[PDB]
Amino acid sequence: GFLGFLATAGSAMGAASLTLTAQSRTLLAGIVQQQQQLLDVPKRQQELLRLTVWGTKNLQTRVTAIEKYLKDQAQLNAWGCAFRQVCCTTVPWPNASLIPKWNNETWQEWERKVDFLEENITALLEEAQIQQEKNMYELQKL
Amino acid sequence: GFLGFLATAGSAMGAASLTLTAQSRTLLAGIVQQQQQLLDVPKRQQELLRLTVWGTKNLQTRVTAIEKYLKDQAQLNAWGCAFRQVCCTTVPWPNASLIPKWNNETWQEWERKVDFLEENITALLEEAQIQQEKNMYELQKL
Amino acid sequence: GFLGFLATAGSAMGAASLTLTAQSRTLLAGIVQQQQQLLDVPKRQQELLRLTVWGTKNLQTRVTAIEKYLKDQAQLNAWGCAFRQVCCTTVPWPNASLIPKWNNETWQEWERKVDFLEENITALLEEAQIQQEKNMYELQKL
Amino acid sequence: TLYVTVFYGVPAWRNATIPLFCATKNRDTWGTTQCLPDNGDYSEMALNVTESFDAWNNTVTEQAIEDVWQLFETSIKPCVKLSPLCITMRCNKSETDRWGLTKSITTTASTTSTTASAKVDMVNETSSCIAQDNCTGLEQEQMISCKFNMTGLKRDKSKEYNETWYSADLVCEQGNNTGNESRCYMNHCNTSVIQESCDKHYWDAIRFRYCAPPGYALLRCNDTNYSGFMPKCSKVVVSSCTRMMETQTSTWFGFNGTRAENRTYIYWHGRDNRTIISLNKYYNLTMKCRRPGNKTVLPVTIMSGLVFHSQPINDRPKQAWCWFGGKWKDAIKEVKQTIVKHPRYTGTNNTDKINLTAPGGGDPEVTFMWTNCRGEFLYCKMNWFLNWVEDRNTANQKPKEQHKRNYVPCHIRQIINTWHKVGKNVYLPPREGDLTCNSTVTSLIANIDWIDGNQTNITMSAEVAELYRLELGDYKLVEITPIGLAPTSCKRY
Amino acid sequence: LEQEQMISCKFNMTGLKRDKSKEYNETWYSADLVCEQGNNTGNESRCYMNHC
Numbered sequence: 001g002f003l004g005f006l007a008t009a010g011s012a013m014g015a016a017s018l019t020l021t022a023q024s025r026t027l028l029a030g031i032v033q034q035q036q037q038l039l040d041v042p043k044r045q046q047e048l049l050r051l052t053v054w055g056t057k058n059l060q061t062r063v064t065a066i067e068k069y070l071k072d073q074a075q076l077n078a079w080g081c082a083f084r085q086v087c088c089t090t091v092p093w094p095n096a097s098l099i100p101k102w103n104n105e106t107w108q109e110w111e112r113k114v115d116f117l118e119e120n121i122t123a124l125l126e127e128a129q130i131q132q133e134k135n136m137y138e139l140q141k142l
Numbered sequence: 143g144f145l146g147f148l149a150t151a152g153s154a155m156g157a158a159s160l161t162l163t164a165q166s167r168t169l170l171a172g173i174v175q176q177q178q179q180l181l182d183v184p185k186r187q188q189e190l191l192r193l194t195v196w197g198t199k200n201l202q203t204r205v206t207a208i209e210k211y212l213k214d215q216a217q218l219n220a221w222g223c224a225f226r227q228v229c230c231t232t233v234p235w236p237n238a239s240l241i242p243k244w245n246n247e248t249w250q251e252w253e254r255k256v257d258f259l260e261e262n263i264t265a266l267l268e269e270a271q272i273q274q275e276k277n278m279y280e281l282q283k284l
Numbered sequence: 285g286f287l288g289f290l291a292t293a294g295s296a297m298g299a300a301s302l303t304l305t306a307q308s309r310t311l312l313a314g315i316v317q318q319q320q321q322l323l324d325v326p327k328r329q330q331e332l333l334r335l336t337v338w339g340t341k342n343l344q345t346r347v348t349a350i351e352k353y354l355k356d357q358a359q360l361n362a363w364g365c366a367f368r369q370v371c372c373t374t375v376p377w378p379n380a381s382l383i384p385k386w387n388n389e390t391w392q393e394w395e396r397k398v399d400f401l402e403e404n405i406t407a408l409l410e411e412a413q414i415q416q417e418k419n420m421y422e423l424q425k426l
Numbered sequence: 427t428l429y430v431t432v433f434y435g436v437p438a439w440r441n442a443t444i445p446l447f448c449a450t451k452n453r454d455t456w457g458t459t460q461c462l463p464d465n466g467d468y469s470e471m472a473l474n475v476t477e478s479f480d481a482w483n484n485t486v487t488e489q490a491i492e493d494v495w496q497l498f499e500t501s502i503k504p505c506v507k508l509s510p511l512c513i514t515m516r517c518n519k520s521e522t523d524r525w526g527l528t529k530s531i532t533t534t535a536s537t538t539s540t541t542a543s544a545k546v547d548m549v550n551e552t553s554s555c556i557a558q559d560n561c562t563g564l565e566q567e568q569m570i571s572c573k574f575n576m577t578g579l580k581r582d583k584s585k586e587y588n589e590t591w592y593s594a595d596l597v598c599e600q601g602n603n604t605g606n607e608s609r610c611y612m613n614h615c616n617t618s619v620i621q622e623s624c625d626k627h628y629w630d631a632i633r634f635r636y637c638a639p640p641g642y643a644l645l646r647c648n649d650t651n652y653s654g655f656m657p658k659c660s661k662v663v664v665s666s667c668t669r670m671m672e673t674q675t676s677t678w679f680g681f682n683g684t685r686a687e688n689r690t691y692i693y694w695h696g697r698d699n700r701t702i703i704s705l706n707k708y709y710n711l712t713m714k715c716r717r718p719g720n721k722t723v724l725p726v727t728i729m730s731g732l733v734f735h736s737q738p739i740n741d742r743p744k745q746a747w748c749w750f751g752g753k754w755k756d757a758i759k760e761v762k763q764t765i766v767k768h769p770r771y772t773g774t775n776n777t778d779k780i781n782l783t784a785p786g787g788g789d790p791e792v793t794f795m796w797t798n799c800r801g802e803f804l805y806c807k808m809n810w811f812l813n814w815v816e817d818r819n820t821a822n823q824k825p826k827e828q829h830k831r832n833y834v835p836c837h838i839r840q841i842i843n844t845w846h847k848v849g850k851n852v853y854l855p856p857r858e859g860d861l862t863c864n865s866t867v868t869s870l871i872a873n874i875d876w877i878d879g880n881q882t883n884i885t886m887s888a889e890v891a892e893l894y895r896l897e898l899g900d901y902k903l904v905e906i907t908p909i910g911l912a913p914t915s916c917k918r919y
Numbered sequence: 920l921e922q923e924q925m926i927s928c929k930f931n932m933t934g935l936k937r938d939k940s941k942e943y944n945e946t947w948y949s950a951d952l953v954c955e956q957g958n959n960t961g962n963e964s965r966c967y968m969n970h971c
């Protein structure tokens with residue numbers, strides 16, 4: 001589609017350049033080409049669109065494109081900062097033993113050093129957003 | 143997945159505690175487990191993924207998870223207040239004959255008393271948002 | 285579903301009246317009726333839900349409803365102005381040779397005069413949003 | 427002043443009627459193809475809510491019934507059809523006459539014997555009569571050695587084969603056979619085509635549980651007063667997945683149930699007199715069935731290349747039979763007492779006027795107990811058992827049925843009319859070797875039917891599908907719909 | 920108006936019992952038969968279905 005995400009790999013975390021439109025673009029390129037094929041197959045074979053294996057493998061790939069897009073949006077909305085880049089959430093970093101070398105390490109190298117933190121962090125980020133929402137709920141009610 | 147929505151049932155409407163991340167969490171737990179199974183079935187049976195009944199029943203359940211998530215987001219965006227908790231819309235309540243006992247009644251008991259209002263209210267909430275949007279359209283144009 | 289979009293056709297671009305809730309409403313009307321049928325077919329025929337052609341044609345139409353909704357939301361988020369009506373983006377119009385008669389021409393007549401501009405504009409609109417996001421990224425980081 | 431506003435994230439729900447996911451532990455064949463792995467999370471939360479539960483009109487139970495049936499159908503669909511075998515077979519005449527499939531008037535039998543012959547015979551684990559398959563009153567299995575001409579993949583060549591049928595599986599042409607070699611056909615071929623149930627179905631246990639899709643949940647009634655129909659259950663428990671279900675099929679008694687508790691429960695249909703009686707696990711009720719002998723199995727390739735499994739036993743083994751252990755007398759007394767005290771019962775309070783009984787009629791589908799032992803279906807005649815467990819005064823039940831025993835004679839049937847409402851006949855391949863099954867008894871499937879304050883008849887039933895309504899039943903499937911409306915003063919700008 | 924044109928024909932058909940068969944009475948519309956021609960100096964013509 002473009003693969004501009006991978007294009008900056010090796011540039012280090014600082015000044016890596018983050019792009020928020022990148023998932024929309026990979027999905028959009030995908031949907032258009034797959035839709036054209038959905039309408040093209042019936043020109044010769046309309047009956048066996050899902051009966052045989054190719055139509056169930058292609059269904060899983062079309063479903064994955066949609067489910068993947070939505071998982072990112074759902075996780076971001078759970079955190080609430082879907083369009084905030086750095087998001088600036090209130091959950092503290094777990095420990096001082098895992099601090100990135102912002103000017104030496106690449107995001108690819110860094111993320112693999114925090115895989116065991118993400119499991120606890122995702123929940124904490126959601127909890128922080130939930131309490132902020134509870135506080136606003138009460139302000140709107142009263 | 144968690145079922146934290148149902149967990150507070152019986153607590154009364156006031157102080158019920160509303161959570162906005164709850165649908166994202168039910169969807170996310172679902173998508174991950176179903177994706178793992180989509181990749182696991184082909185290990186033994188790749189051809190008959192949708193031909194036989196189990197693959198069409200499971201398709202309806204995967205489709206429902208996505209359609210349900212999107213119906214909530216689409217209805218909320220039609221109203222416009224997707225991330226506003228109480229939303230604070232401008233449509234007046236239909237009559238004084240149906241006022242909740244915020245400190246005695248539960249949301250489960252209350253909603254069943256307004257099922258015949260929701261049919262008219264949904265449309266009114268959308269209309270109110272539409273006029274607000276029309277007013278901003280003109281301000282942006284002029 | 286309502287078709288309020290087409291309902292104002294022929295009114296001219298100025299005062300055409302734009303509605304942002306309109307795609308949510310077409311999708312919502314669709315999902316509810318199709319879900320009712322998904323649950324109704326198994327009453328008599330649960331096994332052949334996707335094996336035969338009708339279930340793959342209906343799958344393509346249900347998939348289209350979802351993919352179409354998401355393409356609009358994905359393109360809008362790439363531009364970033366999903367709920368801003370006129371959006372007020374920073375990309376300049378390509379040339380003075382193509383200026384609408386806001387009080388004479390209809391959106392249907394106008395859009396067909398800019399089909400060859402949209403191909404270049406979509407990318408420019410995304411680029412403008414990307415740089416704005418880069419600027420905020422740096423402000424949040426520093 | 428008061429605006430509708432929108433409350434998102436609301437703790438509320440409505441009735442759902444959607445398909446559920448299955449999840450299992452046995453993934454050797456069926457499980458991998460159709461199910462998710464069992465997560466192992468069986469925890470639940472209690473809610474301070476009141477809800478309406480019903481077992482005979484649910485979505486959870488009605489999927490269990492249809493799903494078990496449907497997974498059966500997709501398993502047999504590709505197996506060898508036996509229409510090529512619906513030919514005249516040449517059967518030994520003596521054995522056809524002895525078992526009564528054909529007639530003879532040259533046997534002119536006459537018997538003189540003692541009529542005051544009723545006996546009481548008890549067996550237990552520590553007995554040679556079980557090990558040797560020779561308990562008082564057991565006879566020979568009833569098998570007709572038959573020959574037939576079958577063609578394989580070579581087309582222009584054929585062979586004669588040795589097949590021994592259970593009498594239950596043959597029709598046999600009658601009239602003017604003054605010699606030998608009677609002419610027999612399979613019992614259910616001519617009105618239909620018999621298909622072999624080749625993919626090991628019923629040779630192992632099928633267990634699975636259901637899970638709600640995202641946005642949905644299962645509520646369960648966790649009362650002790652739940653009797654199948656309960657309009658207001660005060661103990662409502664919420665979870666995402668059901669308990670593990672045993673998809674076992676039988677008549678009269680249910681075996682290996684998950685709802686095995688130290689209590690007797692009786693579920694009644696709200697609009698009917700049909701019930702499922704669980705049995706109290708306190709009494710360790712168990713049924714141990716045996717298939718004496720050592721079977722040989724011979725694969726035969728038929729024309730299309732698919733294989734049929736023949737049974738060339740060429741021997742005369744004893745009848746298949748079942749032994750009932752555990753404290754049956756006391757478990758049954760509790761059933762009678764539980765019925766007397768039940769909210770829906772307005773019959774007799776005299777437990778000596780409440781009796782277990784077979785359904786009437788001459789139809790084997792209801793009068794015999796039908797049970798599955800690793801792939802072979804057995805049909806048991808239970809008069810000896812019922813007379814024993816009830817300590818019945820037999821007296822006038824014809825010499826053979828006037829015994830009190832804790833075991834019953836049974837027979838094997840290979841051509842089976844399946845349990846769902848289909849009318850489909852399948853052939854069950856024989857198991858090689860000897861068979862033994864040791865199952866627990868967890869339920870009694872019966873109707874309770876009384877018309878007065880004397881005689882209540884707990885009538886054993888053949889409605890195997892209702893067994894699924896004891897395994898599940900207490901579940902309700904609901905949709906979480908977390909958007910609410912409510913008047914409040916807090917209007918935007 | 921004339922008569923419908925129908926040829927009463929007999930044939931031997933085998934059912935589910937395989938080694939047994941019966942003769943059946945079938946009346947065809949002429950439009951549906953082919954019929955072999957030449958040197959039938961008796962009766963019982965030899966016909967097949969029109970499109971088989």
Ligand SMILES: *[C@@H]1O[C@H](CO)[C@@H](O[C@@H]2O[C@H](CO)[C@@H](O[C@@H]3O[C@H](CO[C@H]4O[C@H](CO[C@H]5O[C@H](CO)[C@@H](O)[C@H](O)[C@@H]5O)[C@@H](O)[C@H](O[C@H]5O[C@H](CO)[C@@H](O)[C@H](O)[C@@H]5O[C@H]5O[C@H](CO)[C@@H](O)[C@H](O)[C@@H]5O)[C@@H]4O)[C@@H](O)[C@H](O[C@H]4O[C@H](CO)[C@@H](O)[C@H](O)[C@@H]4O)[C@@H]3O)[C@H](O)[C@H]2NC(C)=O)[C@H](O)[C@H]1NC(C)=O
Pocket residue numbers: 440441478479480483655656657658696697698
């Ligand atoms: C979520 O899921 C749950 C779980 O399934 C749902 O809960 C169930 O909801 C059903 C309705 O949707 C309820 O059934 C209905 O009950 C009505 C009331 O029944 C009683 O009163 C009857 C007569 O009373 C009249 O007069 C009084 C005042 O004097 C009025 O107030 C009444 O309204 C009436 O006008 C009486 O006959 C009933 O007793 C008989 O039926 C009950 C059935 O529950 C039996 O248990 C009794 O033993 C008795 O049985 C006789 O009749 C049956 C035939 O049904 C025969 O088989 C028996 O042999 C015997 O002769 C009660 O005392 C009923 O009026 C109503 O029936 C009408 O409507 C249905 C269609 O809905 C038609 O098919 C009928 O033919 C008839 O016209 C119906 O039975 C369930 O009780 C309830 N279950 C539980 C556990 O609570 C829930 O709704 C779902 N929610 C959502 C949102 O989906």
Ligand SMILES: *[C@@H]1O[C@H](CO)[C@@H](O[C@@H]2O[C@H](CO)[C@@H](O[C@@H]3O[C@H](CO[C@H]4O[C@H](CO)[C@@H](O)[C@H](O)[C@@H]4O)[C@@H](O)[C@H](O[C@H]4O[C@H](CO)[C@@H](O)[C@H](O)[C@@H]4O[C@H]4O[C@H](CO)[C@@H](O)[C@H](O)[C@@H]4O)[C@@H]3O)[C@H](O)[C@H]2NC(C)=O)[C@H](O)[C@H]1NC(C)=O
Pocket residue numbers: 626629630631674681682797798799800862863864865866
């Ligand atoms: C009510 O509940 C009870 C309790 O759960 C249940 O009884 C049990 O049923 C299960 C399932 O049928 C039985 O488990 C099987 O037992 C056989 C026999 O094992 C004994 O005898 C052998 C003799 O060789 C001894 O070696 C052995 O130690 C035991 O004493 C096993 O053979 C079965 O395993 C097969 O499948 C495995 C899959 O992983 C293979 O790895 C293994 O090699 C076996 O393969 C054989 O079968 C295959 C069929 O697919 C075939 O293809 C192969 O070629 C080969 O033939 C399995 O362990 C268990 O023993 C029963 N226990 C008791 C006490 O009865 C009741 O059935 C249930 N009743 C109802 C009505 O629901």
Ligand SMILES: *[C@@H]1O[C@H](CO)[C@@H](O[C@@H]2O[C@H](CO)[C@@H](O[C@@H]3O[C@H](CO[C@H]4O[C@H](CO)[C@@H](O)[C@H](O)[C@@H]4O)[C@@H](O)[C@H](O[C@H]4O[C@H](CO)[C@@H](O)[C@H](O)[C@@H]4O)[C@@H]3O)[C@H](O)[C@H]2NC(C)=O)[C@H](O)[C@H]1NC(C)=O
Pocket residue numbers: 688689706708756
């Ligand atoms: C798992 O499941 C088992 C089986 O149901 C339970 O075992 C039963 O437990 C109950 C409660 O303790 C027992 O009931 C009591 O039996 C006593 C003994 O009575 C014997 O003699 C009389 C004749 O006089 C016989 O009818 C009877 O069957 C016995 O042979 C009684 O003395 C007790 O009486 C009490 O209640 C009555 C009201 O009914 C009062 O009037 C009395 O004054 C007194 O308070 C009582 O009836 C029952 O016998 C046990 N059954 C068996 C087979 O052992 C387990 O308890 C259960 N496990 C758990 C953990 O709950």
Ligand SMILES: *[C@@H]1O[C@H](CO[C@@H]2O[C@@H](C)[C@@H](O)[C@@H](O)[C@@H]2O)[C@@H](O[C@@H]2O[C@H](CO)[C@@H](O)[C@H](O)[C@H]2NC(C)=O)[C@H](O)[C@H]1NC(C)=O
Pocket residue numbers: 548549550551552
């Ligand atoms: C298995 O049964 C034996 C014999 O008991 C008799 O026969 C049974 C089939 C049944 O009809 C019983 O009611 C009969 O009493 C048991 O052996 C006896 O055990 C009792 C103690 O409970 C002892 O007093 C007797 O002397 C024993 N009899 C003999 C001949 O030794 C045996 O214990 C039972 N097995 C099990 C596992 O319970």
Ligand SMILES: *[C@@H]1O[C@H](CO[C@@H]2O[C@@H](C)[C@@H](O)[C@@H](O)[C@@H]2O)[C@@H](O[C@@H]2O[C@H](CO)[C@@H](O)[C@H](O)[C@H]2NC(C)=O)[C@H](O)[C@H]1NC(C)=O
Pocket residue numbers: 597598599600615616617
């Ligand atoms: C399928 O076969 C059954 C039984 O076969 C007949 O009766 C046996 C005892 C034996 O003599 C066979 O050779 C016979 O072919 C048929 O059931 C009988 O149907 C007739 C009516 O035509 C009726 O008078 C008999 O009482 C029935 N007998 C029994 C035992 O049910 C059945 O009709 C056959 N089905 C088809 C489609 O041919």
Ligand SMILES: *[C@@H]1O[C@H](CO[C@@H]2O[C@@H](C)[C@@H](O)[C@@H](O)[C@@H]2O)[C@@H](O[C@@H]2O[C@H](CO)[C@@H](O)[C@H](O)[C@H]2NC(C)=O)[C@H](O)[C@H]1NC(C)=O
Pocket residue numbers: 953954955956971
């Ligand atoms: C299918 O059959 C037709 C017709 O059958 C032949 O002609 C009938 C009048 C009768 O005499 C039948 O017994 C005959 O078998 C075949 O059509 C004929 O084909 C030949 C060429 O081989 C041609 O010369 C004739 O004119 C055709 N006659 C007609 C009426 O069309 C046809 O070829 C057969 N198809 C196949 C695959 O065998």
Ligand SMILES: *[C@@H]1O[C@H](CO)[C@@H](O[C@@H]2O[C@H](CO)[C@@H](O)[C@H](O)[C@H]2NC(C)=O)[C@H](O)[C@H]1NC(C)=O
Pocket residue numbers: 551556557558714861862863864
């Ligand atoms: C079911 O129970 C029977 C006992 O009633 C088991 O059979 C015994 O097995 C042991 C070990 O091989 C032998 O020493 C005994 O002699 C056997 N008893 C009899 C009466 O034959 C049987 O193995 C159990 N389960 C299965 C599946 O076979």
Ligand SMILES: *[C@@H]1O[C@H](CO)[C@@H](O[C@@H]2O[C@H](CO)[C@@H](O)[C@H](O)[C@H]2NC(C)=O)[C@H](O)[C@H]1NC(C)=O
Pocket residue numbers: 696697698699772875876877878879
């Ligand atoms: C279950 O069976 C009992 C026994 O026949 C039924 O009880 C009768 O109900 C009618 C009213 O419909 C009364 O007039 C009779 O007097 C009752 N008979 C007795 C012996 O009490 C009962 O209605 C049946 N249950 C259902 C749901 O149909």
Ligand SMILES: *[C@@H]1O[C@H](CO)[C@@H](O)[C@H](O)[C@H]1NC(C)=O
Pocket residue numbers: 009010011012
């Ligand atoms: C990648 O390698 C090229 C040389 O092939 C070098 O010029 C460039 O600066 C490198 N970029 C990064 C981020 O290391």
Ligand SMILES: *[C@@H]1O[C@H](CO)[C@@H](O)[C@H](O)[C@H]1NC(C)=O
Pocket residue numbers: 094095097098116117
């Ligand atoms: C603390 O740092 C170590 C790395 O030295 C890491 O393995 C561990 O998981 C960290 N603990 C927490 C709570 O983050």
Ligand SMILES: *[C@@H]1O[C@H](CO)[C@@H](O)[C@H](O)[C@H]1NC(C)=O
Pocket residue numbers: 100101102103104
């Ligand atoms: C990068 O490595 C150098 C040593 O070569 C070190 O002095 C510097 O502090 C490191 N950068 C960061 C961000 O830690």
Ligand SMILES: *[C@@H]1O[C@H](CO)[C@@H](O)[C@H](O)[C@H]1NC(C)=O
Pocket residue numbers: 151152153154474
């Ligand atoms: C629910 O019931 C428990 C007692 O079992 C009680 O302590 C708790 O306060 C109740 N909660 C609500 C919301 O009623």
Ligand SMILES: *[C@@H]1O[C@H](CO)[C@@H](O)[C@H](O)[C@H]1NC(C)=O
Pocket residue numbers: 236237239240258259
């Ligand atoms: C007025 O209140 C009654 C309840 O008493 C309700 O049934 C009715 O629908 C309400 N009318 C409107 C317009 O909300």
Ligand SMILES: *[C@@H]1O[C@H](CO)[C@@H](O)[C@H](O)[C@H]1NC(C)=O
Pocket residue numbers: 242243244245246
């Ligand atoms: C709750 O009920 C009491 C009476 O028991 C009543 O005085 C009170 O006003 C009710 N609460 C609300 C919110 O209406």
Ligand SMILES: *[C@@H]1O[C@H](CO)[C@@H](O)[C@H](O)[C@H]1NC(C)=O
Pocket residue numbers: 293294295296
């Ligand atoms: C459409 O035509 C009708 C006459 O049939 C006219 O009254 C109306 O003003 C026209 N609307 C537009 C937008 O041209």
Ligand SMILES: *[C@@H]1O[C@H](CO)[C@@H](O)[C@H](O)[C@H]1NC(C)=O
Pocket residue numbers: 378379381382400401
């Ligand atoms: C300039 O205007 C002409 C119409 O006269 C149009 O065809 C052309 O594509 C426009 N060029 C650009 C860069 O928009």
